[PDB]
Design a protein around this ligand. Structure first.
Ligand SMILES: [Mg+2]
Ligand SMILES: [Mg+2]
Ligand SMILES: [Mg+2]
Ligand SMILES: [Mg+2]
Ligand SMILES: [Mg+2]
Ligand SMILES: [Mg+2]
Ligand SMILES: [Mg+2]
Ligand SMILES: [Mg+2]
Ligand SMILES: [Mg+2]
Ligand SMILES: [Mg+2]
Ligand SMILES: [Mg+2]
Ligand SMILES: [Mg+2]
Ligand SMILES: [Mg+2]
Ligand SMILES: [Mg+2]
Ligand SMILES: [Mg+2]
Ligand SMILES: [Mg+2]
Ligand SMILES: [Mg+2]
Ligand SMILES: [Mg+2]
Ligand SMILES: [Mg+2]
Ligand SMILES: [Mg+2]
Ligand SMILES: [Mg+2]
Ligand SMILES: [Mg+2]
Ligand SMILES: [Mg+2]
Ligand SMILES: [Mg+2]
Ligand SMILES: [Mg+2]
Ligand SMILES: [Mg+2]
Ligand SMILES: [Mg+2]
Ligand SMILES: [Mg+2]
Ligand SMILES: [Mg+2]
Ligand SMILES: [Mg+2]
Ligand SMILES: [Mg+2]
Ligand SMILES: [Mg+2]
Ligand SMILES: [Mg+2]
Ligand SMILES: [Mg+2]
Ligand SMILES: [Mg+2]
Ligand SMILES: [Mg+2]
Ligand SMILES: [Mg+2]
Ligand SMILES: [Mg+2]
Ligand SMILES: [Mg+2]
Ligand SMILES: [Mg+2]
Ligand SMILES: [Mg+2]
Ligand SMILES: [Mg+2]
Ligand SMILES: [Mg+2]
Ligand SMILES: [Mg+2]
Ligand SMILES: [Mg+2]
Ligand SMILES: [Mg+2]
Ligand SMILES: [Mg+2]
Ligand SMILES: [Mg+2]
Ligand SMILES: [Mg+2]
Ligand SMILES: [Mg+2]
Ligand SMILES: [Mg+2]
Ligand SMILES: [Mg+2]
Ligand SMILES: [Mg+2]
Ligand SMILES: [Mg+2]
Ligand SMILES: [Mg+2]
Ligand SMILES: [Mg+2]
Ligand SMILES: [Mg+2]
Ligand SMILES: [Mg+2]
Ligand SMILES: [Mg+2]
Ligand SMILES: [Mg+2]
Ligand SMILES: [Mg+2]
Ligand SMILES: [Mg+2]
Ligand SMILES: [Mg+2]
Ligand SMILES: [Mg+2]
Ligand SMILES: [Mg+2]
Ligand SMILES: [Mg+2]
Ligand SMILES: [Mg+2]
Ligand SMILES: [Mg+2]
Ligand SMILES: [Mg+2]
Ligand SMILES: [Mg+2]
Ligand SMILES: [Mg+2]
Ligand SMILES: [Mg+2]
Ligand SMILES: [Mg+2]
Ligand SMILES: [Mg+2]
Ligand SMILES: [Mg+2]
Ligand SMILES: [Mg+2]
Ligand SMILES: [Mg+2]
Ligand SMILES: [Mg+2]
Ligand SMILES: [Mg+2]
Ligand SMILES: [Mg+2]
Ligand SMILES: [Mg+2]
Ligand SMILES: [Zn+2]
Lengths: 60, 97, 204, 101, 149, 127
RNA sequence: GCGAAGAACCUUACCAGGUCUUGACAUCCUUUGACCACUCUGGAGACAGAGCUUUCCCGGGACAAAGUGACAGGUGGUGCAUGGUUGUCGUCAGCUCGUGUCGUGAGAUGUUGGGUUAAGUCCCGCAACGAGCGCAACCCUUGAUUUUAGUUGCCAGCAUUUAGUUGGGCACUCUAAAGUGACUGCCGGUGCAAGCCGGAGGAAGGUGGGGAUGACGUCAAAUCAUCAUGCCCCUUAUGACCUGGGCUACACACGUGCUACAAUGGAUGGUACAAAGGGUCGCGAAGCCGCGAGGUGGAGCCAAUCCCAUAAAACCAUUCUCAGUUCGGAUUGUAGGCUGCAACUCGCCUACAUGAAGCCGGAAUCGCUAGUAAUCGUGGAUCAGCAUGCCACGGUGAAUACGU
């Protein structure tokens, strides 16, 4: 059950608090950052590719 | 009496844009106050490195915003026209008040 | 032990981002529009030997540059393929899209292209050793300072998977001012799935 | 004179020192020598073997405990002390001086 | 087994009031949770009590007590033939003062008065007269070394 | 008629200014016994004026911010030492002999992931 | 305290009951082209039944209702068929090549030996002379300083104000771009040398402090549940929708933590000193109301400007006076506050009452070499609400290392 999960998450919920967030590339429910709408794994790989502007590996 | 704020993710292209704006304003106008470096703002994102296990292995990423502020004191039609007609690079964001 | 993505280690150090736009309060939607654009361009110009796509934004205006090996397939006879792509991208983004085309000279010095080549030979049932060695030969005679390739998977349809790698010259991965290009592509075999990794150390 | 900020002083100077100490006066060796002079074939077995591999004739003073068959113009004498070695070497050298002119 | 040799030693500072390093070491030994000010004020109050009661400066009283409770011999464990035995050994000067201060504070915390300034002052005064808990701690240490000599 | 110094310690920075006078110390428009109610801190602050024999010839007015009270005092001490160094070159050995010109370089370290502090590590168990 | 950077409903994959079958989600087909939204009736809801109803544009296209397939759909199995990503030894110091020599040959030497180093780091020897990937350097940050630049930052000499406030100025801090600066560079001793012990100057001295950086290989190590994928299975069900429950159970054993067992302390009153961060469907001031959690109110802010924002330990007075207590706070009774459709199972917070164990912990076992350990607060991600967890920030600030 994954396409049904994604479709139900995209639909308008019955109540406002029913709504949750999923990663927009892979429909993953946990660990979704909401500046990027990306889960941690997709975030990491896209950041390594260089396709997320501004972000770079943090040395400090 | 004219304020310009420039923001970008790196200081090289933004330095070029600020210096170019100052040059054009000096050419077509009368006065300008040098670009004041506003503090950069950085945000940190810590992410688990593995796919399933291994809490103790992580990875930090960062995102920095660099800012500059410019003032033109003697505003003239030529200065405003030249400043508005500039073509700044993509990735540098300009805000004129 | 694991290695860090060589491109990720050099973004912001000696390399540059592929998405050169700045945004606030419109960052996630811009990012995902860019992802959709990249995927649709990658699915259309598949056999055009496309090396790099870069996207910029300025005031409801999307500029796309496609570094490709052979622009004749991308830039059509007089603008057929380019205008089809531009119209489709307009319908995909609901913005004004301008498409710019450049040609990669010395296409054997780019890692993605050679990885595509090796994956294509491996899908066509060519021995992995032959493809790896010949790709190394061409890349070195193209003017590189270092080449390294590996192919990993069920090599030759065996029951147990393994990896084989070859190299020529030097590839200093720990040096930050070294300019290593890197690419990984999958070959779709009837026995499973094979992975091809290429490091190219150029002059810089 | 200066090409490195400090790596010159750090590395290059000792590099030349050690290299010239090992090399000596052969910094302009154009080709292979036409002859060799050996103080003794025992302590310099590597040199005499290498010369033998090249079929180059050799001349050398030896002791009572050296190998004379390897040298085709062997001249046993007392290679210890200083005066005898200096005298033999000076004789051979001013001999080549009077003929190379 | 590794250790690559002798190491540097810490450089404490003389106390701002009683210009000696040993007062600083005592204050550090009484410190808890990085609260320098509390132990520093406690020591100043204890020396006030000492000067009030005895009538002389507290520094020479403190030095007499420390000279009276510094050890000479101590018991150390040696593993030979698969068995561990206690053996005599002589302390260096640094370890001598370290053991003196350690025992002073340890047996001053175990007295039975209301505050800590009183406990420290009474322990110091007892040690200056060859009596107290800290004094007997070095008496048996001398005894324990002899019984295993 | 004014000798200036800048002191730093931890995250504290102090603008010290020194003017001929009577010995009146002023800290942040507040008295130096009201700002510092302890005594050893005052001793460490006036170490630079005691190392040389110029304790009562000067007034110091300071302007400190950042860090805590001991950091306040250390920054003040460094600033007054540098101001005295500006007053006369011949003070340079003495202030160097007590280490009052060194800006203390040790600052709080960094928290590392997988650890509970800079170096503190979780409790370990084989089983 | 592992996936889980947020389980009341949703998440949810599990269970009970109620429903669906080209389908909740995609392409093509055949007729219609804007369908959806809204009102009322029944139902726990999914769903059914009537009316207003749906406004494509320029034969194209993406949307849209009906009927039918071709097909879709599996968080179903195998990580021992795989790609990708990661752990571990371990930031341990290794892994090799070219040209020569020694071996009948596979091979060997360099890379062995003695010292030194954080290090195959370097020196001296030696039939080898060199080089490459690993070490080191290039990148980030911190400690000193120069130039360029002075607003929203700073206020010294000047007038002003509840106030750096207003005028005025970049002097000083500060901010951030480009440079300088440290190299055993100089001195003494020691050594054949590398190096070692001390000394000068200097903000800094021996890779100054700390990051990112993880070679060749090991464990058929972890993950078919982030993703993708060969092969094997289901297809009026192992797919799909809903309401309720469960993941929070409780004789017990283990792992990681928080709070204490009090006088270096408890209660009451007064009163100083930070850094790093977050804020536009958001942060939310003043004033007023409440014992309190909070309510009301709406200022200033797309922010070096406004808000979160009270720092707490520390310090100063009065009191308690060694007592299972003016310690400790579990547990329980009543009355409330917020978020949310909804707080019973099962949220967090407050007021009054109640006041358990606990007197420093057995055999044993863990972390840490300096701004470290120890201790005190602060912010952030996830997030309507919910952390003693995780990730970062500063305040105060030690003891010890003879030695293998
Ligand atoms: Mg799927
Ligand atoms: Mg939620
Ligand atoms: Mg995460
Ligand atoms: Mg991850
Ligand atoms: Mg682990
Ligand atoms: Mg690491
Ligand atoms: Mg690793
Ligand atoms: Mg990688
Ligand atoms: Mg890699
Ligand atoms: Mg693999
Ligand atoms: Mg020490
Ligand atoms: Mg102190
Ligand atoms: Mg002032
Ligand atoms: Mg002030
Ligand atoms: Mg003042
Ligand atoms: Mg004031
Ligand atoms: Mg500060
Ligand atoms: Mg770290
Ligand atoms: Mg931890
Ligand atoms: Mg643990
Ligand atoms: Mg255990
Ligand atoms: Mg843990
Ligand atoms: Mg749970
Ligand atoms: Mg349910
Ligand atoms: Mg399938
Ligand atoms: Mg299988
Ligand atoms: Mg499995
Ligand atoms: Mg596998
Ligand atoms: Mg495995
Ligand atoms: Mg298994
Ligand atoms: Mg694997
Ligand atoms: Mg198995
Ligand atoms: Mg190993
Ligand atoms: Mg090994
Ligand atoms: Mg080896
Ligand atoms: Mg050997
Ligand atoms: Mg090396
Ligand atoms: Mg390195
Ligand atoms: Mg600074
Ligand atoms: Mg020195
Ligand atoms: Mg430091
Ligand atoms: Mg460093
Ligand atoms: Mg297994
Ligand atoms: Mg294992
Ligand atoms: Mg296992
Ligand atoms: Mg398993
Ligand atoms: Mg599957
Ligand atoms: Mg999958
Ligand atoms: Mg799983
Ligand atoms: Mg599974
Ligand atoms: Mg999941
Ligand atoms: Mg913990
Ligand atoms: Mg605790
Ligand atoms: Mg109480
Ligand atoms: Mg109070
Ligand atoms: Mg404050
Ligand atoms: Mg602040
Ligand atoms: Mg927040
Ligand atoms: Mg807050
Ligand atoms: Mg705060
Ligand atoms: Mg009781
Ligand atoms: Mg309760
Ligand atoms: Mg309840
Ligand atoms: Mg509940
Ligand atoms: Mg109560
Ligand atoms: Mg009761
Ligand atoms: Mg009891
Ligand atoms: Mg008691
Ligand atoms: Mg231990
Ligand atoms: Mg250590
Ligand atoms: Mg703590
Ligand atoms: Mg506490
Ligand atoms: Mg706290
Ligand atoms: Mg804490
Ligand atoms: Mg907090
Ligand atoms: Mg918090
Ligand atoms: Mg929250
Ligand atoms: Mg916490
Ligand atoms: Mg709580
Ligand atoms: Mg804690
Ligand atoms: Mg040790
Ligand atoms: Zn994802």
């Amino acid at each position: 059950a994954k396409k049904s999960m994604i479709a139900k998450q995209k639909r308008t919920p019955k109540y406002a608090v029913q709504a949750y967030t999923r990663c927009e590339r892979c429909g993953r429910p946990h660990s979704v950052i909401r500046k990027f709408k990306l889960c941690r794994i997709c975030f990491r790989e896209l950041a390594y590719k260089g396709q997320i502007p501004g972000v770079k590996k943090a040395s400090w | 009496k004219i304020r310009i704020r420039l923001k970008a993710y790196d200081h090289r292209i933004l330095d070029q844009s600020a210096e170019k704006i100052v040059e054009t304003a000096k050419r077509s106008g009368a006065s300008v106050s040098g670009p004041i470096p506003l503090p950069t703002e950085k945000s940190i994102y810590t992410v688990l490195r593995a796919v399933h296990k291994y809490k103790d292995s992580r990875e930090q990423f960062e995102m920095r915003t660099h800012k500059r502020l410019i003032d033109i004191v003697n505003p003239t039609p030529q200065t405003v026209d030249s400043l508005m007609r500039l073509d700044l690079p993509s990735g540098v964001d300009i805000e004129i008040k | 032990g694991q290695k860090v993505h060589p491109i990720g280690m050099r973004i912001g150090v000696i390399r540059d981002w592929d998405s050169k736009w700045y945004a606030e309060k419109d960052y996630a939607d811009f990012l995902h529009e860019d992802l959709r654009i990249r995927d649709y361009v990658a699915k259309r110009l598949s056999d055009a030997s496309v090396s790099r796509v870069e996207i910029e934004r300025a005031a409801n205006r999307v500029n796309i540059t496609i570094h490709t090996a052979k622009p004749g397939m991308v830039i059509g006879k007089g603008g057929s393929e380019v205008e089809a792509l531009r119209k489709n991208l307009n319908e995909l983004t609901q913005k004004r899209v301008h498409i710019n085309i450049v040609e990669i000279k010395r296409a054997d010095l780019d890692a993605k292209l050679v990885a595509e080549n090796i994956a294509r030979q491996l899908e066509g049932r060519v021995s992995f050793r032959r493809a790896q060695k010949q790709a190394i030969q061409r890349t070195m005679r193209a003017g590189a300072k270092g080449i390294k390739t590996q192919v990993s998977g069920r090599l030759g349809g065996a029951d147990i998977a393994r990896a084989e790698h070859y190299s020529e010259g030097t590839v200093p991965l720990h040096t930050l001012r070294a300019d290593i290009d890197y690419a990984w592509e999958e070959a779709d075999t009837t026995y499973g799935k094979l992975g091809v990794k290429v490091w190219i150390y150029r002059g810089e | 004179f200066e090409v490195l900020p400090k790596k010159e002083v750090v590395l290059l100077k000792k590099e030349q020192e050690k290299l010239e100490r090992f090399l000596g006066g052969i910094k302009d060796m154009k080709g292979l020598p036409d002859a060799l002079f050996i103080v003794d074939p025992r302590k310099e077995r590597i040199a005499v073997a290498e010369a033998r591999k090249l079929h180059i004739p050799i001349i050398g003073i030896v002791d009572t405990n050296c190998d004379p068959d390897e040298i085709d113009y062997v001249i046993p004498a007392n290679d210890d002390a200083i005066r005898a070695v200096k005298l033999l070497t000076a004789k051979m050298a001013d001999a080549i001086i009077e003929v190379n002119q | 087994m590794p250790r690559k040799g002798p190491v540097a030693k810490r450089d404490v500072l003389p106390d701002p009031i009683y210009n000696s390093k040993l007062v600083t070491r005592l204050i550090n030994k009484m410190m808890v949770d990085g609260k320098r000010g509390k132990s520093q004020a406690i020591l100043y109050s204890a020396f006030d009590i000492i000067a009030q009661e005895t009538g002389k400066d507290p520094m020479e009283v403190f030095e007499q007590a420390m000279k009276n409770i510094m050890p000479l011999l101590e018991v150390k464990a040696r593993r030979v033939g698969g068995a561990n035995y206690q053996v005599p050994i002589e302390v260096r000067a640094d370890r001598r003062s370290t053991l003196g201060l350690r025992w002073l504070v340890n047996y001053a915390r175990l007295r039975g008065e209301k505050t800590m300034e009183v406990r420290v002052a009474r322990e110091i005064m007892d040690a200056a007269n060859n009596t107290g808990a800290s004094v007997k701690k070095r008496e048996d240490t001398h005894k324990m070394a002899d019984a295993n000599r | 008629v004014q000798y200036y110094g800048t002191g730093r310690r931890k995250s504290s920075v102090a603008r010290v200014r020194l003017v001929p006078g009577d010995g009146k110390i002023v800290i942040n428009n507040r008295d130096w016994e009201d700002y510092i109610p302890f005594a050893a801190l005052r001793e460490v602050i006036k170490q630079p004026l005691v190392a040389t024999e110029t304790l009562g010839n000067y007034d110091v007015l300071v302007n400190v911010h950042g860090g805590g009270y001991t950091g306040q005092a250390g920054a003040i001490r460094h600033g007054v030492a540098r101001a005295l160094l500006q007053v006369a070159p011949e003070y340079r050995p003495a202030l160097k002999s007590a280490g009052l010109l060194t800006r203390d370089p040790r600052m709080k370290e960094r928290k590392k992931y997988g650890l509970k502090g800079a170096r503190r590590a979780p409790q370990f168990s084989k089983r």
